[PDB]
Subunit: 494 residues, 4 copies
């Protein structure tokens, strides 16, 4: 039961989306969109720049004004709309999963069974919170009545990467809209198409115009205009550390807008001697190779206790030699290409660093094919902590395996990184599971599993892996602004 | 560092406490209080009855009126007072721990190091919640402003047992007072003395008069008047199942007052083959014998996997043969007497049932001494589920050990009881710890420990072990009444 | 836009619903169902009794067992099912609103626009909470890891009245199912039909069998079997004070099951001189007359400041003389009949008490028509606090108006009642709105409105109007059982 | 009852506080501290710079390591320590209030009755939250057990201004320490003395060494080292907008540390025709003049409805002509000096702008005295929105009064500012109170009062008045880092 589109994908939505209207770029400029598997242009899309961002902000601001339909409508009706949007995405699931695969280099079975399901589930999750966002009444000192309103912040700019275009769009807009904000979204330039399809469903669902505005285009242009905008109240971002820095600096220099960032990881696994070995090998393998390694949570440092290290490495190699590379639309294909040249170049450079720095190559180590940005799935053993491949996020299908004998020592090595997005602990010992997970400086710690992510759980980094949490009860906080209202009364009673 | 009173205990507070005044009984009647270790009368105390309860209710109601000092004072000042009460109990810790030991038959080192510390810590815990009890603001449908006040309920009657006189007093009054209620407390007739000492500290701390009223006396008289009172808003009770039934019936027949009950247990432990055996033997042993078995959470059914059953039983017997019986005030003494004749008679009867029903006696089985209600610490092995000693709460120093070989089967046996107060799981397997604890129908489940109780955790039964939770964030709910206030406005905004 | 059924209502579902199966009664007995507007039998329905209740409990218990589909399914999938049930009720909205009108004596426009909309909205609300019900992790003293699971309680029996058959069914099952409980519902004998239609939609939606069981029949028979059942964990009830007492007594005598009750009110309004007079007259009028006065929150004592009292009474009379009595299915009809003989007899008796006790009759005072249990809308002025019509819940179209001159005095009169379900305050003074609403002993206080009830707000009584809250964040608490899990660890860290 | 020090203040604590040790500066450099009332040096204090900050960070980091006393101690014991610190500050209240007055230019009666009381109350408030900071257990999709730990972040740098030296120290360290963080505090260079006294009490209370480190010194040196530190996890700051920008930029460039800022305001009051005029005049007057206008929440734009504008201005002038300037230690003195030259120069410049720009001078307008940075209390009427005195935070005793006739218009004018810290609404109309307060873009809105600030309420800005909230339940969030722990299990049950 993996259904496909029974007819070919026609691209339809290629324009800037503002006030539920399709707009050309102010400049009239357009930019190409490619398929990473063939390197062939799929279509051209309107190139948004500062002007267009200003128009989206004006629209978003107007939709947020006191008295507008989006401010005055029932919170439950905000939730009603998100739920309807989820039904619509469910309706065009074949279409959207195909678009995502073709534009994103993303295996179609994953796109359909995982990304699409996740979008749908996350929207329904966010829909449910709308009329459950609540302030407090507070027994303040003195004769006063004090309450708080957890209001929407206002206009939220949301800058989205290319690895999970749809999932990231929903993670950004679900919470924001549930809380009553308005949004200006900038998709990755590589991957605007699915966002614009969803924009058509936003209109069809009946969101008031200006509540969601989507401005495709480039980072230093559209992206920067957002980060430096004097009338955007908050910017949320997932992507590189470099750009994260640029965003915070821009925000600080302009209007001190709120910022929340999700950036790299170099997430470690710790595998103890008593671990279920096959379970640990399987989760860690998928933990690093998922979506061609193009995952913020990629399990890119795997520490295995010496007595099981050789066995662990052997079975990891076996598992990795089993992939089929090719077009992510063809059933049976189990590894697509990397998103683009730059990522491809970075991965190969880093692989080359691994060889030169004296890591042990178990398989892969080079590119594949005549077309597309394919990289062989690659495994390194005997990796040490000073190697580039141990320190830097690779974002490619490249796994690092490394041995330890001292538990104290491996916790410190696991934490000796400016990243801290997630980690994995594999053991049958209760005390070790609890104590190790407490001691890892990482936003999500999985025990005897890896890459388990759901709408009900907050997600975010420690340290330079970012700030703030997305999703879960806790994530909803980052899309509200608390206002305290305190009223003089003649006499208070408990 | 176990300090003692350097001079003999003089009893001073022997009267009914209402409106911060010491009152004689309306009847003029008094009743004896005894020391369970010597069977000798310590003093006489004013016998409260219906009349006196009516006076306490009138006082409590007046103190709760809108505009009174207790309703209008800052919530933080309610907390200030509880904290001061805790300082005072800390000041008279030697006095109070000695009184508790002498009146309660309670080992003095436990009284000092545990009961007193617990009272003090729980008061400070409850103090901290006072100005953190909060309502909500709610995004209701339509043009309205809606908030909730989590108000105190009103006059709470609180009926207290004899096993932990002081601890139970603090568990009842800490939460109730933090939430702004007023209370009418009825101590166990066996153990009024420590409650009345604390009453003097309530006055010294400066609680408004009528906020705490203490009416010593008997159950069918004072107790029943509370349960059937038409102006008491809530009754809380810890004690027997029988009386729990009487209370609920009385409440239903009178004014449908809120009721929360903590009643027996027949709490099971499940010890798996892989358990740390000594750890499990030690916690389970203390789990059943603590305070002469006079604990609601007594670990009175211990299921041990067959392959470690004989070993478990052997070491449990060793551990139990090591006690020293005698006066709980004398250092070195490690087991005091039972509270009174009735409890003593019940324990011996049940021991006799165990012998007649064909359980295996490993040690004890009879009374001890010429004076005091002492029972030898007693262990039974080969106990089956149909035996009285397997089914009924003993509330004496009597341990039941029982074997299993099928994990499915033992979970069902562990749950095949109308009680459900707590349980213990002993294992090194993570999955078993989590899955077993989920499947036990019990309010508290300890893993690789037992009898761990703290102010930060809610505590209460499943099934006929009672209803409601005490302590923790969650317990505070049972001492508030939610009022929804909904105000028409011209236009709402998110 | 008030659409109707374009074809006549065929009754189809007339049987006991257990394990998603339609069952005959064990006895083979059936009972008539009538239309209160014509006094004519609509159909016959299987009469459930103790036996049938036992079968529903066995089914509900089996569906709740550890490992069953309802325990193991994702919480979000529980929510998915409630949302689907809401879509289905939306699909059969014409059918269900017509059935409700014909069986319940309920105005069809209200049934369609209000009851049906409320059911649908409340289900969607409850759906949203399913995967947002959360426990805690707790910084307990000592080296332990402590968490809580907010588990479903288990088998919940739910006894439902006839005034809002559908709304009450949804209020009971929405929260219960969202929290993962299983239910045994007993509809009012007068009004089983809509519950059984919904049961067919429960099957169609795909709830696991045994999760919802509906047992139509009579109170002393089916109802009592529930209240006294040894394997039902909680009973929830809306109805009379008398039966509420019977339920609590039954629960206390049997297995100490949890009980939550919603019972009468004699809800007061206080209208100050500065009130918007027309607004206050309009809300108070609808507050008392809604659904032929057959509302728990009926505004059955209206206190008006002397200087505006005569004016208030005059305009209230005008408003009340405007009704059209008749069949609730016919457009234009603005007052249907009372549910049945007993209610009719009670209303007329109480009207007669009002005349004999010297209250002033402004209009009505007698029955209407040749068929159906119609009572003229009736207004009394100069009512005093000792009159039966001031003290007792009438549950008929009978309004009491009463004057005050002293604000202190009227708050005490408003509170001088064993009821406390709701109240209304009408004023333009901020301080008075806040202080008066704080001082009224009532679960919901409306300011400058009345009868505003939504899914986002908890709802329940003070005093003998019941215990517990339904709906809102807070109401969900009453459908969970908290279990504390505390695990020994070697060393804890903050 | 305003007691004083019965002997002269001896300055004792003048050094850098690290690991509970008093340190000289690495450079050996010291800097003068002055009394703003006399312009005379009080003493010299060790000048902390980058080196010293590095030492404090190393100490704070070590104290935060897994396994340290501050990580492993009971949460309730963290709370115990804060409560003890509060007792100690209460003990040295005369000393501390005098030091604060003499160093801060702060009226002694305010220092004693307000600042000191606030510190003490806020510490006790923060103490109470320690063991009530809780994570969640979460019904995630799939067979997993998921919980969250709300952990301390780590090393928090805290940069403090001179207007409320003590209050700001407690607002920063109370929450941070309650949540289990360690701190590096940099006092205002003008006002280090009271922070260092408190440091001695931190030692006396028994906080583990390295938990609180205080590094007096200058902003571009000590301050910047904090903001740019690669091992500080979070920086909190109260002060200028300029420095706020510098901090965020520094944080973004270095290690992307979390940042929370409280910056200026230009907080508006809106006074409607129906307002209680005297109440509004009194609160607004104190709202702007408190502590010589050196308050972030200064009510520096007062919009009054035309029909009451002249009256409002007249009575405001009367109230302002009543002050006595002089040394803040002398009883009867009702206005002290400004903190220093720079602030003095800024205030006078802005006053001069007001005159040149054509605002109407009602009183004041110039400096006062031969010594000290005194400015006459100054009132301007007929102020327009384009004037410097309407746009810029003055931070001096300078009040702006301004008329409106259109309610829509005044809400927009009130919001037409990049600030948004607080606002005041004065009216007897319920609907206006609620709707206006909702529509103002400000973190705290007072109704019929002003400057009401308590520990139980969160406090923070909208827009460029900052980000994050301090105090209240909500403020505690900004001092925790959420970690999600997700464990694979064989089968989950609800
Ligand atoms: N709070 C509310 O919404 C309601 C209040 N009432 C009050 O009660 C008065 C009498 O009306 P009734 O129809 O008699 O309400 P009731 O309390 O007699 O009936 C309501 C439900 O309770 C059940 N019941 C009856 N006897 C029972 C028993 N022995 N054990 C368990 N369940 C039993 C009924 O079958 C029905 O399902 C009304 O005049 C009104 O004042 C009645 C219905 C709803
Ligand atoms: Cl395996
Ligand atoms: Cl790039
Ligand atoms: Cl090519
Ligand atoms: Cl969380
Ligand atoms: Cl051991
Ligand atoms: Cl007894
Ligand atoms: Cl007895
Ligand atoms: Cl004897
Ligand atoms: Cl809890
Ligand atoms: Cl509750
Ligand atoms: Cl009107
Ligand atoms: Cl009846
Ligand atoms: Cl009846
Ligand atoms: Cl007839
Ligand atoms: Cl609530
Ligand atoms: Cl006044
Ligand atoms: Cl400066
Ligand atoms: Cl000079
Ligand atoms: Cl809040
Ligand atoms: Cl937050
Ligand atoms: Yb880039
Ligand atoms: Yb190529
Ligand atoms: Yb008894
Ligand atoms: Yb004897
Ligand atoms: Yb009845
Ligand atoms: Yb008739
Ligand atoms: Yb500066
Ligand atoms: Yb000078």
């Amino acid at each position: 039961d993996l259904p496909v589109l029974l007819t070919d994908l026609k691209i339809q939505y290629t324009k800037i989306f503002i006030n539920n209207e399709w707009h050309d770029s102010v400049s009239g400029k357009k930019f190409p969109v490619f398929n990473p598997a063939t390197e062939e242009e799929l279509c051209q899309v309107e190139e948004g720049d500062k002007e267009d961002v200003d128009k989206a902000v004006k629209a978003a601001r107007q939709a947020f004004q006191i008295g507008s339909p989006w401010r005055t409508m029932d919170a439950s009706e905000r939730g009603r709309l998100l739920y309807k949007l989820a039904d619509l995405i469910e309706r065009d699931r074949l279409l959207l999963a195909t678009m995502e695969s073709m534009n994103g280099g993303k295996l179609y079975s994953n796109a359909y069974l995982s990304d699409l399901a996740g979008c749908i589930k996350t929207l329904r999750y966010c829909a449910g919170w709308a009329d459950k966002i609540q302030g407090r009444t507070i027994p303040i000192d003195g004769n006063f009545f004090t309450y708080t309103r957890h209001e929407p912040i206002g206009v939220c700019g949301q800058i989205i990467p290319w690895n999970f275009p749809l999932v990231m769009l929903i993670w950004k807009i679900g919470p924001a809209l549930s809380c009553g904000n308005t949004v200006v979204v900038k998709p990755a330039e590589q991957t605007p198409l699915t966002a614009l399809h969803v924009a058509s469903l936003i209109k069809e669902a009946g969101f008031p115009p200006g509540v969601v505005n989507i401005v495709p285009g480039y980072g230093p242009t559209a992206g920067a205009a957002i980060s430096s905008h004097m009338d955007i109240d908050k910017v949320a971002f997932t992507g590189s550390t470099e750009v994260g820095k640029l965003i915070k600096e821009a925000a600080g220099k302009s209007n001190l807008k709120r910022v929340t960032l999700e950036l790299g990881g170099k997430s470690p696994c710790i595998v103890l001697a008593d671990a279920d070995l096959d379970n640990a090998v399987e989760f860690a393998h998928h933990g690093v190779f998922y979506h061609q390694g193009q995952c913020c949570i990629a399990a890119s440092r795997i520490f295995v206790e010496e007595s099981i290290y050789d066995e662990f490495v052997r079975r990891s190699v076996e598992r990795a030699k089993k992939y089929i590379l090719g077009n992510p639309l063809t059933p049976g294909v189990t590894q697509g290409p990397q998103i683009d040249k730059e990522q491809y170049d970075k991965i190969l450079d880093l692989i080359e660093s691994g060889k030169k720095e004296g890591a042990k190559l178990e398989c892969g180590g080079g590119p594949w094919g005549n077309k597309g940005y394919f990289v062989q799935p690659t495994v390194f053993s005997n990796v040490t902590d000073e190697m580039r491949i141990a320190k830097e996020e690779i974002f490619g299908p490249v796994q690092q395996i490394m041995k330890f004998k001292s538990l104290d020592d491996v916790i410190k090595r696991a934490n000796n990184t400016f990243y801290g997005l997630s980690a994995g602990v594999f053991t049958k010992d209760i005390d070790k599971a609890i104590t190790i997970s407490s001691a890892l400086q990482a936003g999500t710690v999985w025990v005897n599993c890896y890459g388990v992510v759901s709408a009900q759980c907050p997600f975010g980094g420690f340290k330079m892996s970012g700030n703030g949490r997305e999703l879960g009860e806790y994530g909803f906080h980052e899309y509200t602004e608390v206002k305290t209202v305190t009223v003089k009364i003649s006499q208070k009673n408990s």
